[model samples]
Target: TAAVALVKANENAAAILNLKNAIQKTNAAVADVVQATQSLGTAVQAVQDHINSVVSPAITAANY
Candidate 1:
């Protein structure tokens, strides 16, 4: 029983270390996705601006 308890303690320590690294990697992955989403939002705004400044004006001129 004593030997088993020692083994378990060692295993638990290793598991904690593994969890720490996993969390770090998870945080980094989330940051990468967050950056992409922000960039995507920027691109969407650019598309809207182009449509407003170019496409809408052309359509208005044609109707006149």
Candidate 2:
């Protein structure tokens, strides 16, 4: 759920950055948004992978 929220926020930020870049033709804000989205996506994926790989195994072991 947190990951989804971050994704939504990233999307909104990207949209705003795109609009600003289109109006002013400045790449700084757009670039920042792009980098932010990339970082957030990477982080969220890492958390998901960790949950599946580590937590799932531990939970399964505990159950057994």
Candidate 3:
């Protein structure tokens, strides 16, 4: 019957929509992880810069 076919068609559409939404969510989560790691790398670089600045002066004064 046409009615049965229409029902099945609707069900398939709904299933496909759910899968699309799930993929969208996964992409967003991946972006979040990327952002977090980038910030972390920036923070570590700042710490390294500060440490070098302090160590460099001490080494220079010690030699003089």
Candidate 4:
């Protein structure tokens, strides 16, 4: 789950960067990329929260 969250965050950052470049070129496709980036950010946050609140605790407990 943590790995998935990191992947999602990376994907979102890439989409945002790509869209920013597209915006410079006056491309309408930038809107689509922006939306994708937003969704990805939300997904990454959710997964991160889950890992912090649940998975981490479980792993720590298991290790001890």
Candidate 5:
């Protein structure tokens, strides 16, 4: 316990601030990746779709 006490006593406020900043940056990077993946999926799904000329499309609650 003596060594633990000594270690804490030498801790710097700036050190904890730096660690928190690191965690925030890591979270931001993850969010960027998530947004990129969503954009990629959107771009990929933007291609052609089809409906038969025999009938009209039906209305539904989920109509876009």
Candidate 6:
């Protein structure tokens, strides 16, 4: 009975360690995605600014 209990404890500890490693890997992936999202956001903002800059002159011409 005692030997069985020791084996069970080891199994539980190993499971916990595996979970921690997986969490670390997931966090690293999340960090990469956050960085990529930010870069995409900046690119979109620049495109929006450029389009607005060109379109504003046309709107003014159409009003008169």
Pick by TM-score: which candidate is best? 1
Residue pairs in clash, model 1: none
Worst 10 residues of 2 by lDDT: 20-29
| Candidate 5 lDDT over residue span 1-64, tens digit each | 9898778866866688889999999999999999999998877665323232222343342486
Tens-digit lDDT track of model 2 for 1-64: 9999999999999999989878675576788899999999999999999999999999999987
Q: Which ten residues in a row have the lowest lDDT in candidate 4?
A: 23-32
Residue range with the least summed lDDT across 10 consecutive positions in model 3? 50-59
Candidate 4 lDDT, tens digit per residue, 1-64? Answer: 9999999999999999999987877665777789899999999999999999999999999988
What tens digits encode model 1's per-residue C-alpha lDDT throughout 1-64?
9999999999999999999999999999999999999999999999999999999999999988
TM-score, structure 6 vs. true: 0.78
What TM-score against the true fold does each predicted structure earn?
0.85, 0.58, 0.71, 0.50, 0.54, 0.78
Clash count for candidate 3 is: 0
Native RMSD of candidate 4 (Å)? 22.4
User: What's the lDDT for all of these models?
Assistant: 0.99, 0.92, 0.96, 0.93, 0.73, 0.95
As for model 1, its CA RMSD to the true structure in angstroms is: 1.3
lDDT of 3 by residue, 2-51 (tens): 99999999999999999999999999999999999999999999889977
Deviation in Å, model 5, residue 44 alpha carbon: 1.2
What is the model-wide C-alpha lDDT for candidate 3? 0.96
Q: Whole-model lDDT, candidate 4?
A: 0.93
TM-score order of candidates, top first: 1, 6, 3, 2, 5, 4
Instruction: Give the candidate number with the greatest lDDT.
Output: 1
* Sequence-dependent TM-score of model 2: 0.58
TM-score of 3: 0.71
